[PDB]
Design the sequence.
Protein backbone atom coordinates (compact mmCIF):
# COMPACT_ATOMS: atom_id res chain seq x y z
CA UNK A 1 0.00 0.00 0.00
CA UNK A 2 0.78 3.71 -0.18
CA UNK A 3 0.71 5.91 -3.25
CA UNK A 4 3.64 8.04 -4.39
CA UNK A 5 4.55 10.09 -7.42
CA UNK A 6 6.85 7.39 -8.79
CA UNK A 7 9.37 7.77 -11.58
CA UNK A 8 10.94 5.02 -13.63
CA UNK A 9 14.41 3.85 -12.60
CA UNK A 10 16.78 6.17 -14.43
CA UNK A 11 19.98 4.15 -14.90
CA UNK A 12 19.35 3.27 -18.53
CA UNK A 13 19.09 6.96 -19.41
CA UNK A 14 21.96 8.06 -17.13
CA UNK A 15 24.31 6.00 -19.27
CA UNK A 16 23.30 8.11 -22.33
CA UNK A 17 23.78 11.66 -20.96
CA UNK A 18 26.71 13.65 -22.28
CA UNK A 19 27.82 17.29 -22.31
CA UNK A 20 27.72 19.26 -25.56
CA UNK A 21 29.71 22.47 -25.79
CA UNK A 22 30.07 24.74 -28.77
CA UNK A 23 30.87 28.43 -28.60
CA UNK A 24 30.09 29.66 -25.08
CA UNK A 25 27.01 27.41 -24.77
CA UNK A 26 27.02 24.19 -22.74
CA UNK A 27 24.01 21.88 -22.51
CA UNK A 28 23.05 18.21 -22.28
CA UNK A 29 23.05 15.74 -25.12
CA UNK A 30 21.65 12.26 -25.55
CA UNK A 31 24.09 9.67 -26.89
CA UNK A 32 22.50 6.61 -28.56
CA UNK A 33 24.49 4.37 -30.87
CA UNK A 34 26.85 6.80 -32.69
CA UNK A 35 24.60 9.90 -32.54
CA UNK A 36 24.33 12.63 -29.90
CA UNK A 37 20.99 14.48 -29.86
CA UNK A 38 20.74 17.97 -28.41
CA UNK A 39 18.74 21.21 -28.82
CA UNK A 40 19.68 23.14 -31.91
CA UNK A 41 19.83 26.48 -30.06
CA UNK A 42 23.33 25.39 -28.97
CA UNK A 43 24.25 26.67 -32.46
CA UNK A 44 26.38 29.87 -32.36
CA UNK A 45 24.93 33.40 -32.47
CA UNK A 46 16.09 36.19 -34.08
CA UNK A 47 17.72 33.17 -35.76
CA UNK A 48 17.85 31.35 -39.10
CA UNK A 49 19.28 28.00 -37.99
CA UNK A 50 19.93 26.64 -41.48
CA UNK A 51 22.09 29.72 -42.10
CA UNK A 52 23.83 29.34 -38.77
CA UNK A 53 24.52 25.62 -38.99
CA UNK A 54 26.10 25.72 -42.48
CA UNK A 55 28.62 28.13 -40.88
CA UNK A 56 29.75 25.50 -38.33
CA UNK A 57 32.37 22.74 -38.45
CA UNK A 58 32.50 19.34 -36.71
CA UNK A 59 35.42 20.51 -34.56
CA UNK A 60 33.20 23.32 -33.24
CA UNK A 61 31.25 20.75 -31.18
CA UNK A 62 32.93 19.55 -27.99
CA UNK A 63 31.17 16.43 -26.69
CA UNK A 64 32.08 15.12 -23.21
CA UNK A 65 31.05 11.62 -22.10
CA UNK A 66 32.36 11.46 -18.56
CA UNK A 67 36.11 11.91 -18.77
CA UNK A 68 36.24 10.88 -22.44
CA UNK A 69 36.34 13.24 -25.42
CA UNK A 70 33.85 12.30 -28.17
CA UNK A 71 35.04 13.07 -31.72
CA UNK A 72 32.28 14.58 -33.89
CA UNK A 73 32.43 13.32 -37.49
CA UNK A 74 29.19 14.74 -38.86
CA UNK A 75 26.26 16.94 -38.00
CA UNK A 76 22.75 17.51 -39.27
CA UNK A 77 19.59 19.27 -38.16
CA UNK A 78 16.28 17.46 -37.61
CA UNK A 79 13.66 20.14 -36.92
CA UNK A 80 14.58 21.68 -33.55
CA UNK A 81 17.17 19.03 -32.56
CA UNK A 82 20.77 18.66 -33.68
CA UNK A 83 22.19 15.24 -34.55
CA UNK A 84 25.96 15.04 -33.97
CA UNK A 85 27.43 11.90 -35.50
CA UNK A 86 30.38 10.72 -33.37
CA UNK A 87 33.01 8.10 -34.10
CA UNK A 88 32.09 5.91 -31.10
CA UNK A 89 28.85 4.03 -30.52
CA UNK A 90 27.66 4.23 -26.92
CA UNK A 91 28.31 0.79 -25.36
CA UNK A 92 25.53 1.53 -22.85
CA UNK A 93 22.84 2.20 -25.48
CA UNK A 94 19.64 0.52 -24.24
CA UNK A 95 16.91 -0.80 -26.45
CA UNK A 96 14.98 2.38 -27.23
CA UNK A 97 12.29 4.11 -29.29
CA UNK A 98 11.38 7.71 -30.01
CA UNK A 99 7.67 8.18 -29.28
CA UNK A 100 5.53 11.31 -29.07
CA UNK A 101 3.08 11.34 -26.15
CA UNK A 102 -0.48 12.88 -25.82
CA UNK A 103 -1.54 15.60 -23.37
CA UNK A 104 -2.64 13.78 -20.23
CA UNK A 105 0.12 11.17 -20.48
CA UNK A 106 2.95 11.02 -17.96
CA UNK A 107 6.71 10.46 -18.11
CA UNK A 108 9.87 10.57 -16.04
CA UNK A 109 12.39 13.44 -16.37
CA UNK A 110 16.07 13.00 -15.67
CA UNK A 111 17.17 16.55 -14.91
CA UNK A 112 20.81 17.06 -15.95
CA UNK A 113 23.51 19.73 -15.77
CA UNK A 114 26.76 19.68 -17.76
CA UNK A 115 25.86 16.14 -18.83
CA UNK A 116 25.66 14.94 -15.19
CA UNK A 117 22.30 13.57 -13.94
CA UNK A 118 20.92 15.63 -11.06
CA UNK A 119 17.51 14.17 -10.13
CA UNK A 120 14.51 12.26 -11.40
CA UNK A 121 10.84 13.15 -11.13
CA UNK A 122 7.48 12.26 -12.68
CA UNK A 123 5.56 14.74 -14.89
CA UNK A 124 2.43 14.97 -17.02
CA UNK A 125 2.15 16.68 -20.40
CA UNK A 126 -0.47 19.34 -19.68
CA UNK A 127 -3.46 19.83 -21.97
CA UNK A 128 -1.82 23.09 -23.13
CA UNK A 129 1.38 21.17 -24.12
CA UNK A 130 3.56 22.53 -21.32
CA UNK A 131 4.96 20.52 -18.43
CA UNK A 132 5.22 21.79 -14.88
CA UNK A 133 8.87 20.83 -14.54
CA UNK A 134 11.75 21.64 -12.25
CA UNK A 135 14.67 23.02 -14.24
CA UNK A 136 17.47 25.53 -13.69
CA UNK A 137 19.89 27.18 -16.10
CA UNK A 138 21.81 24.47 -17.92
CA UNK A 139 19.17 21.74 -17.92
CA UNK A 140 18.41 22.21 -21.65
CA UNK A 141 18.76 18.85 -23.34
CA UNK A 142 17.50 16.84 -20.37
CA UNK A 143 15.06 14.18 -21.55
CA UNK A 144 11.74 12.72 -20.51
CA UNK A 145 11.02 9.05 -20.91
CA UNK A 146 9.05 5.92 -20.08
CA UNK A 147 10.33 2.37 -19.65
CA UNK A 148 8.48 -0.73 -20.83
CA UNK A 149 10.21 -3.91 -19.72
CA UNK A 150 13.71 -3.30 -21.12
CA UNK A 151 12.87 -0.60 -23.71
CA UNK A 152 13.28 3.13 -23.12
CA UNK A 153 10.66 5.21 -24.96
CA UNK A 154 12.11 8.70 -25.13
CA UNK A 155 9.33 11.29 -25.47
CA UNK A 156 10.62 14.71 -24.44
CA UNK A 157 13.65 16.86 -24.76
CA UNK A 158 13.74 20.01 -22.70
CA UNK A 159 14.26 23.40 -24.40
CA UNK A 160 12.97 26.39 -22.48
CA UNK A 161 11.10 28.01 -19.62
CA UNK A 162 7.99 30.10 -20.33
CA UNK A 163 7.20 33.35 -18.48
CA UNK A 164 4.91 31.52 -16.03
CA UNK A 165 7.66 29.15 -14.88
CA UNK A 166 6.37 26.13 -16.82
CA UNK A 167 8.44 24.32 -19.42
CA UNK A 168 8.35 23.62 -23.14
CA UNK A 169 10.24 21.20 -25.32
CA UNK A 170 10.20 18.80 -28.25
CA UNK A 171 9.86 15.14 -28.95
CA UNK A 172 13.09 13.42 -29.94
CA UNK A 173 12.48 14.16 -33.63
CA UNK A 174 12.70 17.86 -32.74
CA UNK A 175 9.03 18.74 -33.15
CA UNK A 176 7.77 20.99 -30.39
CA UNK A 177 4.95 20.02 -28.10
CA UNK A 178 2.44 22.84 -28.53
CA UNK A 179 2.77 26.21 -30.23
CA UNK A 180 6.18 27.11 -28.87
CA UNK A 181 9.28 28.00 -30.90
CA UNK A 182 13.00 28.03 -30.01
CA UNK A 183 13.46 31.74 -30.48
CA UNK A 184 12.81 34.77 -28.29
CA UNK A 185 9.15 35.73 -28.66
CA UNK A 186 6.46 36.83 -26.24
CA UNK A 187 5.13 33.27 -26.32
CA UNK A 188 3.00 32.18 -23.38
CA UNK A 189 1.23 29.05 -22.28
CA UNK A 190 -2.41 28.96 -23.32
CA UNK A 191 -5.04 28.35 -20.66
CA UNK A 192 -4.84 24.86 -19.12
CA UNK A 193 -7.48 22.36 -18.00
CA UNK A 194 -7.54 19.52 -15.49
CA UNK A 195 -7.09 15.98 -16.84
CA UNK A 196 -10.40 14.42 -15.78
CA UNK A 197 -9.65 10.78 -16.58
CA UNK A 198 -6.49 11.01 -14.46
CA UNK A 199 -8.32 12.53 -11.47
CA UNK A 200 -10.69 9.55 -11.67
CA UNK A 201 -7.76 7.14 -11.84
CA UNK A 202 -6.32 8.74 -8.69
CA UNK A 203 -9.69 8.43 -6.93
CA UNK A 204 -9.58 4.69 -7.68
CA UNK A 205 -6.05 4.65 -6.25
CA UNK A 206 -7.41 6.22 -3.08
CA UNK A 207 -10.17 3.63 -2.80
CA UNK A 208 -7.61 0.87 -3.34
CA UNK A 209 -5.65 2.45 -0.46
CA UNK A 210 -8.60 2.72 1.97
CA UNK A 211 -9.62 6.37 1.41
CA UNK A 212 -13.40 6.11 0.87
CA UNK A 213 -14.96 9.18 2.56
CA UNK A 214 -15.78 10.84 -0.80
CA UNK A 215 -17.78 7.92 -2.17
CA UNK A 216 -21.53 8.28 -2.42
CA UNK A 217 -24.82 6.59 -3.27
CA UNK A 218 -25.38 8.81 -6.32
CA UNK A 219 -24.73 8.12 -9.97
CA UNK A 220 -24.72 10.19 -13.14
CA UNK A 221 -24.82 9.99 -16.90
CA UNK A 222 -21.76 10.89 -18.96
CA UNK A 223 -23.51 13.98 -20.38
CA UNK A 224 -24.57 15.31 -16.97
CA UNK A 225 -21.08 14.73 -15.57
CA UNK A 226 -19.51 16.58 -18.51
CA UNK A 227 -21.93 19.47 -18.00
CA UNK A 228 -20.39 19.91 -14.55
CA UNK A 229 -16.84 19.19 -15.78
CA UNK A 230 -16.59 22.10 -18.25
CA UNK A 231 -17.94 24.39 -15.53
CA UNK A 232 -14.86 23.62 -13.41
CA UNK A 233 -12.33 23.71 -16.28
CA UNK A 234 -12.04 19.91 -16.56
CA UNK A 235 -11.44 18.05 -19.81
CA UNK A 236 -14.47 16.22 -21.20
CA UNK A 237 -14.68 12.56 -20.27
CA UNK A 238 -15.01 10.31 -23.32
CA UNK A 239 -16.43 6.82 -23.58
CA UNK A 240 -12.89 5.63 -24.34
CA UNK A 241 -11.81 7.10 -20.99
CA UNK A 242 -14.65 5.16 -19.33
CA UNK A 243 -13.47 1.96 -20.99
CA UNK A 244 -9.87 2.58 -19.87
CA UNK A 245 -11.03 2.92 -16.26
CA UNK A 246 -12.86 -0.41 -16.62
CA UNK A 247 -10.22 -2.57 -14.92
CA UNK A 248 -9.96 -0.15 -11.99
CA UNK A 249 -13.76 -0.16 -11.80
CA UNK A 250 -13.69 -3.95 -11.66
CA UNK A 251 -10.98 -4.20 -9.00
CA UNK A 252 -12.84 -1.86 -6.62
CA UNK A 253 -16.41 -2.59 -7.69
CA UNK A 254 -17.28 1.10 -8.14
CA UNK A 255 -18.89 1.76 -11.51
CA UNK A 256 -17.06 4.49 -13.42
CA UNK A 257 -20.15 6.70 -13.55
CA UNK A 258 -20.55 6.27 -9.79
CA UNK A 259 -17.03 7.60 -9.31
CA UNK A 260 -17.94 10.50 -11.61
CA UNK A 261 -20.86 11.24 -9.28
CA UNK A 262 -18.34 11.52 -6.42
CA UNK A 263 -16.02 13.76 -8.43
CA UNK A 264 -19.07 15.88 -9.26
CA UNK A 265 -19.83 16.37 -5.56
CA UNK A 266 -16.14 16.94 -4.77
CA UNK A 267 -16.10 19.79 -7.30
CA UNK A 268 -19.39 21.26 -6.11
CA UNK A 269 -18.55 21.05 -2.41
CA UNK A 270 -14.81 21.02 -1.98
CA UNK A 271 -13.08 18.63 0.35
CA UNK A 272 -14.22 20.15 3.69
CA UNK A 273 -10.78 19.91 5.29
CA UNK A 274 -10.27 16.23 4.52
CA UNK A 275 -7.51 14.88 2.31
CA UNK A 276 -7.20 12.12 -0.29
CA UNK A 277 -3.95 10.15 -0.58
CA UNK A 278 -2.31 12.88 1.51
CA UNK A 279 -3.44 15.63 -0.89
CA UNK A 280 -5.89 18.48 -0.26
CA UNK A 281 -6.34 18.93 -4.06
CA UNK A 282 -7.70 16.66 -6.76
CA UNK A 283 -4.53 15.24 -8.40
CA UNK A 284 -4.43 14.81 -12.16
CA UNK A 285 -0.88 13.61 -13.00
CA UNK A 286 -1.53 9.85 -12.59
CA UNK A 287 -2.90 7.95 -15.60
CA UNK A 288 -5.00 4.79 -15.29
CA UNK A 289 -1.87 2.84 -16.31
CA UNK A 290 0.19 4.49 -13.55
CA UNK A 291 -2.37 3.61 -10.89
CA UNK A 292 -2.61 -0.02 -11.99
CA UNK A 293 1.20 -0.31 -12.23
CA UNK A 294 1.74 1.05 -8.71
CA UNK A 295 -1.15 -1.09 -7.39
CA UNK A 296 -0.50 -4.54 -8.94
CA UNK A 297 3.29 -4.99 -9.04
CA UNK A 298 4.65 -4.39 -12.54
CA UNK A 299 8.46 -3.99 -12.83
CA UNK A 300 10.92 -3.20 -15.63
CA UNK A 301 14.44 -4.25 -16.76
CA UNK B 1 12.10 27.34 -11.78
CA UNK B 2 9.46 24.87 -10.66
CA UNK B 3 9.57 22.64 -7.61
CA UNK B 4 9.11 18.88 -7.72
CA UNK B 5 9.49 15.97 -5.35
CA UNK B 6 12.83 14.95 -6.83
CA UNK B 7 14.66 11.68 -6.24
CA UNK B 8 18.32 10.98 -6.84
CA UNK B 9 19.25 9.25 -10.09
CA UNK B 10 18.96 5.55 -9.32
CA UNK B 11 21.40 3.85 -11.71
CA UNK B 12 24.15 3.33 -9.15
CA UNK B 13 21.74 1.40 -6.92
CA UNK B 14 20.04 -0.47 -9.79
CA UNK B 15 23.36 -2.15 -10.52
CA UNK B 16 23.36 -3.60 -6.95
CA UNK B 17 19.85 -5.15 -6.79
CA UNK B 18 19.62 -8.92 -6.83
CA UNK B 19 17.00 -11.56 -6.03
CA UNK B 20 17.38 -13.72 -2.93
CA UNK B 21 15.37 -16.92 -2.69
CA UNK B 22 15.46 -19.48 0.06
CA UNK B 23 12.61 -21.82 0.93
CA UNK B 24 9.41 -20.42 -0.57
CA UNK B 25 10.42 -16.80 0.16
CA UNK B 26 11.72 -14.44 -2.53
CA UNK B 27 12.84 -10.89 -1.81
CA UNK B 28 15.39 -8.27 -2.84
CA UNK B 29 19.02 -8.20 -1.84
CA UNK B 30 21.74 -5.59 -2.07
CA UNK B 31 25.00 -6.77 -3.62
CA UNK B 32 28.10 -4.71 -2.72
CA UNK B 33 31.60 -6.09 -3.18
CA UNK B 34 31.21 -9.83 -2.37
CA UNK B 35 28.30 -9.51 0.10
CA UNK B 36 24.54 -9.59 -0.50
CA UNK B 37 22.47 -7.85 2.20
CA UNK B 38 18.83 -8.78 2.72
CA UNK B 39 16.18 -8.94 5.48
CA UNK B 40 16.69 -11.84 7.83
CA UNK B 41 13.01 -12.84 7.78
CA UNK B 42 13.84 -14.62 4.49
CA UNK B 43 15.10 -17.33 6.88
CA UNK B 44 12.92 -20.50 6.81
CA UNK B 45 9.97 -21.12 9.14
CA UNK B 46 7.16 -16.21 16.66
CA UNK B 47 10.81 -16.69 15.65
CA UNK B 48 14.25 -17.22 17.18
CA UNK B 49 16.47 -16.28 14.24
CA UNK B 50 19.73 -17.51 15.75
CA UNK B 51 18.09 -20.93 16.10
CA UNK B 52 16.71 -20.79 12.59
CA UNK B 53 19.87 -19.61 10.86
CA UNK B 54 22.17 -22.27 12.38
CA UNK B 55 19.78 -24.77 10.72
CA UNK B 56 20.52 -23.38 7.22
CA UNK B 57 23.22 -24.13 4.65
CA UNK B 58 24.86 -21.90 2.02
CA UNK B 59 23.18 -23.90 -0.77
CA UNK B 60 19.80 -23.00 0.75
CA UNK B 61 20.22 -19.42 -0.54
CA UNK B 62 19.56 -18.90 -4.24
CA UNK B 63 20.89 -15.49 -5.32
CA UNK B 64 20.01 -14.19 -8.81
CA UNK B 65 21.88 -11.25 -10.35
CA UNK B 66 20.13 -10.80 -13.67
CA UNK B 67 20.58 -14.03 -15.59
CA UNK B 68 23.61 -15.09 -13.52
CA UNK B 69 23.56 -17.48 -10.56
CA UNK B 70 25.49 -16.17 -7.54
CA UNK B 71 27.23 -18.87 -5.46
CA UNK B 72 26.84 -18.30 -1.70
CA UNK B 73 30.01 -19.24 0.22
CA UNK B 74 29.14 -17.94 3.67
CA UNK B 75 26.37 -16.38 5.69
CA UNK B 76 26.05 -14.42 8.91
CA UNK B 77 23.44 -12.36 10.72
CA UNK B 78 23.92 -8.68 11.60
CA UNK B 79 20.94 -7.66 13.74
CA UNK B 80 17.89 -7.79 11.45
CA UNK B 81 19.83 -8.15 8.17
CA UNK B 82 21.45 -11.22 6.65
CA UNK B 83 24.90 -11.01 5.06
CA UNK B 84 25.39 -13.62 2.31
CA UNK B 85 29.02 -13.86 1.26
CA UNK B 86 29.20 -14.75 -2.45
CA UNK B 87 32.17 -15.82 -4.56
CA UNK B 88 31.91 -12.85 -6.96
CA UNK B 89 32.44 -9.19 -6.17
CA UNK B 90 29.92 -6.93 -7.89
CA UNK B 91 31.79 -5.16 -10.73
CA UNK B 92 29.21 -2.36 -10.52
CA UNK B 93 29.76 -1.62 -6.81
CA UNK B 94 29.76 2.18 -6.43
CA UNK B 95 31.62 4.08 -3.78
CA UNK B 96 29.25 3.74 -0.82
CA UNK B 97 28.64 4.18 2.91
CA UNK B 98 26.10 2.86 5.38
CA UNK B 99 24.62 5.82 7.27
CA UNK B 100 21.66 6.06 9.64
CA UNK B 101 19.45 9.11 9.08
CA UNK B 102 17.40 11.27 11.60
CA UNK B 103 13.62 11.75 11.59
CA UNK B 104 12.97 14.74 9.34
CA UNK B 105 15.66 13.75 6.83
CA UNK B 106 14.78 12.61 3.33
CA UNK B 107 15.98 9.88 0.96
CA UNK B 108 15.24 8.18 -2.33
CA UNK B 109 13.65 4.70 -2.47
CA UNK B 110 14.24 2.31 -5.33
CA UNK B 111 11.22 0.03 -5.12
CA UNK B 112 12.10 -3.46 -6.37
CA UNK B 113 10.40 -6.79 -7.06
CA UNK B 114 12.22 -10.10 -7.63
CA UNK B 115 15.45 -8.10 -7.75
CA UNK B 116 14.18 -5.92 -10.64
CA UNK B 117 13.89 -2.15 -10.04
CA UNK B 118 10.31 -0.92 -10.41
CA UNK B 119 10.28 2.81 -9.59
CA UNK B 120 11.98 5.58 -7.67
CA UNK B 121 10.46 8.12 -5.31
CA UNK B 122 11.47 10.55 -2.57
CA UNK B 123 10.51 9.98 1.10
CA UNK B 124 11.04 11.46 4.55
CA UNK B 125 11.68 9.53 7.75
CA UNK B 126 8.70 10.57 9.86
CA UNK B 127 9.14 11.76 13.44
CA UNK B 128 7.58 8.44 14.56
CA UNK B 129 10.25 6.48 12.58
CA UNK B 130 7.91 5.23 9.86
CA UNK B 131 8.00 6.25 6.21
CA UNK B 132 4.94 6.83 4.08
CA UNK B 133 6.15 4.59 1.28
CA UNK B 134 4.67 2.85 -1.72
CA UNK B 135 5.31 -0.88 -1.54
CA UNK B 136 3.53 -4.06 -2.59
CA UNK B 137 4.12 -7.71 -1.71
CA UNK B 138 7.67 -8.62 -2.67
CA UNK B 139 9.33 -5.24 -2.16
CA UNK B 140 11.05 -6.34 1.07
CA UNK B 141 14.75 -5.65 0.72
CA UNK B 142 14.32 -2.52 -1.39
CA UNK B 143 16.65 0.20 -0.17
CA UNK B 144 16.57 3.92 0.52
CA UNK B 145 19.55 6.10 -0.22
CA UNK B 146 21.13 9.47 -0.86
CA UNK B 147 23.88 10.37 -3.32
CA UNK B 148 26.67 12.85 -2.62
CA UNK B 149 28.80 13.47 -5.68
CA UNK B 150 29.80 9.89 -6.56
CA UNK B 151 29.09 8.22 -3.20
CA UNK B 152 25.90 6.32 -2.37
CA UNK B 153 24.90 6.64 1.30
CA UNK B 154 22.54 3.74 1.93
CA UNK B 155 20.22 4.53 4.86
CA UNK B 156 17.16 2.27 4.71
CA UNK B 157 16.23 -1.26 3.98
CA UNK B 158 12.55 -2.05 3.73
CA UNK B 159 11.02 -4.76 5.94
CA UNK B 160 7.30 -4.44 6.56
CA UNK B 161 3.99 -2.64 6.32
CA UNK B 162 2.22 -1.50 9.51
CA UNK B 163 -1.57 -1.73 9.98
CA UNK B 164 -2.03 1.91 8.91
CA UNK B 165 -0.36 1.37 5.53
CA UNK B 166 2.92 3.07 6.46
CA UNK B 167 6.26 1.30 6.31
CA UNK B 168 9.02 0.24 8.69
CA UNK B 169 12.56 -0.92 8.12
CA UNK B 170 16.17 -0.88 9.24
CA UNK B 171 19.39 0.87 8.49
CA UNK B 172 21.91 -1.21 6.56
CA UNK B 173 23.42 -2.55 9.79
CA UNK B 174 20.05 -4.15 10.50
CA UNK B 175 18.94 -1.88 13.33
CA UNK B 176 15.30 -0.89 13.05
CA UNK B 177 14.18 2.68 12.76
CA UNK B 178 11.78 3.10 15.67
CA UNK B 179 10.23 0.54 17.99
CA UNK B 180 9.33 -2.02 15.36
CA UNK B 181 10.41 -5.67 15.27
CA UNK B 182 10.53 -8.24 12.44
CA UNK B 183 8.00 -10.58 13.96
CA UNK B 184 4.21 -10.68 14.02
CA UNK B 185 3.01 -8.43 16.84
CA UNK B 186 0.22 -5.91 17.20
CA UNK B 187 2.80 -3.17 16.65
CA UNK B 188 1.51 0.17 15.44
CA UNK B 189 2.97 3.51 14.50
CA UNK B 190 3.01 5.98 17.36
CA UNK B 191 1.42 9.39 16.84
CA UNK B 192 3.26 11.52 14.27
CA UNK B 193 4.06 15.24 14.08
CA UNK B 194 4.76 17.65 11.24
CA UNK B 195 8.41 18.49 10.51
CA UNK B 196 8.40 22.25 11.13
CA UNK B 197 11.85 23.10 9.81
CA UNK B 198 10.98 21.36 6.53
CA UNK B 199 7.67 23.24 6.14
CA UNK B 200 9.69 26.45 6.53
CA UNK B 201 12.20 25.27 3.93
CA UNK B 202 9.33 24.61 1.51
CA UNK B 203 7.91 28.09 2.17
CA UNK B 204 11.30 29.51 1.15
CA UNK B 205 11.11 27.34 -1.97
CA UNK B 206 7.74 28.90 -2.74
CA UNK B 207 9.10 32.42 -2.31
CA UNK B 208 12.04 31.54 -4.56
CA UNK B 209 9.44 30.39 -7.11
CA UNK B 210 7.24 33.51 -6.94
CA UNK B 211 4.54 32.32 -4.50
CA UNK B 212 4.38 35.19 -1.96
CA UNK B 213 0.69 35.58 -0.99
CA UNK B 214 1.25 34.10 2.50
CA UNK B 215 3.99 36.53 3.50
CA UNK B 216 3.18 39.18 6.05
CA UNK B 217 4.41 42.23 7.95
CA UNK B 218 4.39 40.39 11.28
CA UNK B 219 7.24 38.78 13.17
CA UNK B 220 7.52 36.51 16.20
CA UNK B 221 9.91 35.20 18.79
CA UNK B 222 10.99 31.56 18.76
CA UNK B 223 9.11 30.87 22.01
CA UNK B 224 5.84 32.40 20.79
CA UNK B 225 6.09 30.51 17.50
CA UNK B 226 6.69 27.22 19.34
CA UNK B 227 3.69 27.92 21.57
CA UNK B 228 1.56 27.87 18.42
CA UNK B 229 3.50 24.96 16.88
CA UNK B 230 2.75 22.38 19.60
CA UNK B 231 -0.90 23.40 19.42
CA UNK B 232 -1.01 22.21 15.79
CA UNK B 233 1.09 19.05 16.31
CA UNK B 234 4.28 20.55 14.83
CA UNK B 235 7.79 19.70 16.00
CA UNK B 236 9.50 22.41 18.06
CA UNK B 237 11.76 24.71 16.09
CA UNK B 238 15.28 24.85 17.52
CA UNK B 239 17.90 27.55 17.17
CA UNK B 240 19.93 25.06 15.12
CA UNK B 241 16.97 24.83 12.72
CA UNK B 242 16.98 28.64 12.49
CA UNK B 243 20.69 28.61 11.68
CA UNK B 244 20.19 25.95 8.99
CA UNK B 245 17.55 28.11 7.31
CA UNK B 246 20.03 31.02 7.33
CA UNK B 247 21.18 30.67 3.72
CA UNK B 248 17.59 30.45 2.47
CA UNK B 249 16.79 33.50 4.61
CA UNK B 250 19.68 35.33 2.97
CA UNK B 251 18.77 34.39 -0.60
CA UNK B 252 15.19 35.65 -0.22
CA UNK B 253 15.75 38.36 2.37
CA UNK B 254 12.98 37.08 4.66
CA UNK B 255 14.18 36.69 8.24
CA UNK B 256 13.53 33.18 9.55
CA UNK B 257 11.32 34.47 12.36
CA UNK B 258 9.33 36.47 9.81
CA UNK B 259 8.65 33.28 7.89
CA UNK B 260 7.60 31.67 11.19
CA UNK B 261 5.09 34.51 11.60
CA UNK B 262 3.63 33.54 8.21
CA UNK B 263 3.49 29.85 9.11
CA UNK B 264 1.78 30.88 12.36
CA UNK B 265 -0.95 32.69 10.42
CA UNK B 266 -1.20 29.85 7.89
CA UNK B 267 -1.90 27.45 10.76
CA UNK B 268 -4.36 29.77 12.48
CA UNK B 269 -6.25 30.67 9.31
CA UNK B 270 -5.81 27.94 6.76
CA UNK B 271 -5.02 28.67 3.16
CA UNK B 272 -8.42 30.14 2.11
CA UNK B 273 -8.56 28.21 -1.15
CA UNK B 274 -5.13 29.29 -2.38
CA UNK B 275 -2.25 26.91 -3.02
CA UNK B 276 1.51 26.98 -2.49
CA UNK B 277 3.81 25.28 -5.00
CA UNK B 278 0.72 23.50 -6.37
CA UNK B 279 -0.19 22.11 -2.92
CA UNK B 280 -3.24 22.89 -0.78
CA UNK B 281 -1.40 21.52 2.31
CA UNK B 282 1.75 22.62 4.12
CA UNK B 283 4.40 20.18 2.80
CA UNK B 284 7.01 18.82 5.20
CA UNK B 285 9.10 16.30 3.18
CA UNK B 286 11.66 18.79 1.80
CA UNK B 287 14.70 19.59 3.96
CA UNK B 288 16.60 22.89 3.76
CA UNK B 289 19.30 20.98 1.83
CA UNK B 290 16.74 19.66 -0.67
CA UNK B 291 15.37 23.14 -1.34
CA UNK B 292 18.81 24.65 -1.87
CA UNK B 293 19.87 21.72 -4.10
CA UNK B 294 16.81 22.03 -6.33
CA UNK B 295 17.17 25.85 -6.37
CA UNK B 296 20.90 26.40 -7.05
CA UNK B 297 21.99 23.62 -9.42
CA UNK B 298 23.87 20.88 -7.56
CA UNK B 299 24.43 17.60 -9.47
CA UNK B 300 25.93 14.19 -8.68
CA UNK B 301 28.06 11.51 -10.41
Sequence:
Amino acid sequence: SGFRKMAFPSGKVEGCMVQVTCGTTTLNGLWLDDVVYCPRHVICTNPNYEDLLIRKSNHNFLVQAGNVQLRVIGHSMQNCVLKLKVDTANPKTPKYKFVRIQPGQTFSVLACYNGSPSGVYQCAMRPNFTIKGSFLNGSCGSVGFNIDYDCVSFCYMHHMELPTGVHAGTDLEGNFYGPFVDRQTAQAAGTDTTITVNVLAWLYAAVINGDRWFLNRFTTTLNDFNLVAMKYNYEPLTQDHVDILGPLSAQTGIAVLDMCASLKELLQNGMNGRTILGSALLEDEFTPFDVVRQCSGVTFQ
Summary: Chain B touches chain A through 52 residues (CB under 8 Å). Residues 15-94 of chain B form a domain with the Thrombin, subunit H fold (CATH 2.40.10.10).
